[PDB]
Design a protein around this ligand. Sequence first.
Ligand SMILES: Nc1ncnc2c1ncn2[C@@H]1O[C@H](COP(=O)(O)OP(=O)(O)O)[C@@H](O)[C@H]1O
Ligand SMILES: [Cl-]
Ligand SMILES: [Cl-]
Ligand SMILES: [Cl-]
Ligand SMILES: [Cl-]
Ligand SMILES: [Mg+2]
Ligand SMILES: [Zn+2]
Length: 527
Amino acid sequence: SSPAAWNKEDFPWSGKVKDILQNVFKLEKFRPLQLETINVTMAGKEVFLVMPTGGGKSLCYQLPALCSDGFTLVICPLISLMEDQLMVLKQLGISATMLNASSSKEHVKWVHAEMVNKNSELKLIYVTPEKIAKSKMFMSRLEKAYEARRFTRIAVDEVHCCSQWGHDFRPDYKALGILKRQFPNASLIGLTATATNHVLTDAQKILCIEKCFTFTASFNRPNLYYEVRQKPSNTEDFIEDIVKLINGRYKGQSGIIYCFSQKDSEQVTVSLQNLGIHAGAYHANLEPEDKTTVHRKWSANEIQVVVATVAFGMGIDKPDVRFVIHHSMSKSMENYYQESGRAGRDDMKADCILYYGFGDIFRISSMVVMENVGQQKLYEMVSYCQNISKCRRVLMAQHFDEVWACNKMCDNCCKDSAFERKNITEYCRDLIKILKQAEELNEKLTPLKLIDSWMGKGAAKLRVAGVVAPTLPREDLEKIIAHFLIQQYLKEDYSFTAYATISYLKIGPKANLLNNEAHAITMQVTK
Ligand SMILES: Nc1ncnc2c1ncn2[C@@H]1O[C@H](COP(=O)(O)OP(=O)(O)O)[C@@H](O)[C@H]1O
Ligand SMILES: [Cl-]
Ligand SMILES: [Cl-]
Ligand SMILES: [Cl-]
Ligand SMILES: [Cl-]
Ligand SMILES: [Mg+2]
Ligand SMILES: [Zn+2]
């Protein structure tokens, strides 16, 4: 059966479920798929829930824990993710606990007693997968609790960690198949955002489950406005553009500015502070006292904007973030989706504005050089930024492999423009004449040196007679070059230097298509 057969408040527990939702959790209604998942697990069946980060996966096992006898075991990979949860539950008046590496002899002792104590109101126990594999004592206590009918539910957070395709894999998650082998009458719930069908199909094998429900929430957030603007060359013109949004459309409202590095974040904060904005900086090197100060003041609306690196992300659930601005592009669409998805968690209209700058390609490419598919993921993001016709949601859905109604909620859906295919081939030939000459001279060209030569500027040795750049503005030339880069007519070449990795361009793998003199390279332009 499908999720629809389960979107129902017909069950013996439904009265109790609505009541605990509204009066213990202080939530009013269920988000998509939350009711259905709760129903399945309450019915004592196995279910995987696939739902975006910050969407409310946890509810789907915390709420059942309260509607059942005994405790729910929660397997969770990071102590910080566990500590996130326990803070929230204590504040709700819920008895929950965790066991840990650095766990007290007194505390471990107390937990063990509670598990077999028939009168316990302790309803959730969080543990790391190390506890299942490397604690004989804890497994026997689970066995006793299971036999005493006090252990009826297993939640495995981050269930994708089970698989050999899932890029946050953890060896101890391979041991977790012991849970359903030993405790077949404990129902299991698997939660993840990052779920491919063959990573899930595999985790289902690792966990020794079959059969299983799989519920997938759409990663579409209908209230989010998605935009890409040209990033300005001048860094002071860029600040002025930001301050005009913040003091105009986002006047009084909460938001985030995401930055490439810690220096960018520190710079942008100061820049805005001097211009009146209540801006605060958040990066990893910050004294953790100040990490909290900034989060505290931002969540409490004293600071209007956090100017941050990706390090501001884990466990952000502030509901009224009205804008996420990307000062630089993310490393990948997956990072973009997740970072911008921190906007508008109250489901009211919120803005996602990405500033695309040519230079950022190379700062990021260089930075992710050691990653298998780093460059390939960056280029997908660049291709999003380069798109001027296609719906932003359509481009995102192509990436998550979802079947997929924007209703004018992205910059490209609101355009009235027409478009056409401009043949830019000769421009590619011309830049390859420049690079060919450069190698015949044993010269390395950074992207700046390529653009300068094309434009008839820069060092005179690096110029090729009869090559004229068009009188298009620079960002247009930059876009033509980014196009050939991601299309691989050109390619990057890295150099590792004492302190930094830097990028140079070269004739890339697809330049041999230009041996065909009829070959055509086209780029979409406005009519
Ligand atoms: N039905 C709901 N209505 C409103 N807020 C919710 C609902 N369900 C969950 N939340 C909130 O959403 C936020 C993120 O939930 P969480 O379970 O931590 O997300 P995930 O594990 O999917 O990242 C939390 O602040 C949580 O309290
Ligand atoms: Cl996500
Ligand atoms: Cl928050
Ligand atoms: Cl077209
Ligand atoms: Cl195109
Ligand atoms: Mg979660
Ligand atoms: Zn759209």
